[PDB]
C-alpha cells in the first residue's frame, strides 16, 4: 500500500493548434513517419471496451 499513499503527477501537455487560422498547411497529401499511423484510432472506434 506504500506505492499509493503520495499522489502521482499526470503530465498533460499544453493545448495549442493553428489549423483553423491557416487551413492551407493541412491538405490531401499529409506527412507521416510510420505507414501504420491510423491503426490506433481504427482499433478504438471498432472495439472501445478493448
Amino acid at each position: 500500500s506504500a506505492w499509493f499513499i503520495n499522489a502521482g503527477m499526470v503530465n498533460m501537455p499544453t493545448l495549442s493548434c493553428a489549423n483553423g487560422y491557416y487551413p492551407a498547411l493541412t491538405n490531401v497529401n499529409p506527412y507521416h513517419r510510420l505507414d501504420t499511423w491510423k491503426d490506433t484510432l481504427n482499433h478504438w472506434v471498432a472495439y472501445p471496451d478493448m
Binding site: 487551413p23 491538405n27 490531401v28 497529401n29 482499433h43
Partner: protein, 50 residues
C-alpha cells in the same frame, strides 16, 4: 448540358450509396476516400474534387 448533368449526379449518388455501407475501421472509409485518390495540390478537398 441536361444530359451531362444527369450523367454526373447519377454517377455520384450511386457511389455514395455503396460508400455509406463501409465500417469506419478500414483504410479507404467515409472520411478518407478523397485524400488517397487526389494526386495534386488543391486548397481544400471540397466542391468539384469530391
Amino acid at each position: 448540358l441536361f444530359y451531362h448533368s444527369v450523367a454526373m449526379i447519377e454517377s455520384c449518388y450511386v457511389e455514395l450509396g455503396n460508400v455509406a455501407r463501409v465500417s469506419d475501421s478500414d483504410a479507404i472509409n467515409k472520411y478518407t476516400f478523397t485524400e488517397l485518390s487526389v494526386q495534386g495540390r488543391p486548397v481544400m478537398n471540397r466542391g468539384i474534387i469530391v
